[PDB]
Amino acid sequence: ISQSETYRRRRQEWEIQRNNAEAELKQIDAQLKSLAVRREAAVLQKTS
């Protein structure tokens, strides 16, 4: 019971940490569509 308990605990650590990285990555892609937009406005700057 103790051994499988430890295994479930560490598994929860894995879950939390992976999930951390995931939320991070979706943040990243949000920033990528941003700097894509800011690019859009800098090209509109060029053409202006």
């Binding site: 941003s34 937009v37 800011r38 859009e40 406005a41 509109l44 700057q45 053409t47 202006s48």
Partner: protein, 48 residues
């Protein structure tokens, strides 16, 4: 010669006018593009 002078003044003054007008027309033509830029940077605030 008086007709001469007064006409020269008409012409200087005429081109000066069409300059002022042509400028304002350009001012509009630019404030359009600069306006669109400003819109897109609001969009980049959406993305952020």
């Amino acid at each position: 010669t008086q007709f001469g002078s007064t006409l020269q003044n008409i012409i200087e003054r005429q081109d000066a006018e069409a300059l002022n007008a042509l400028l304002q027309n350009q001012a509009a033509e630019l404030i359009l593009t600069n306006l669109s830029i400003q819109d897109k940077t609001i969009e980049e605030l959406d993305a952020e």
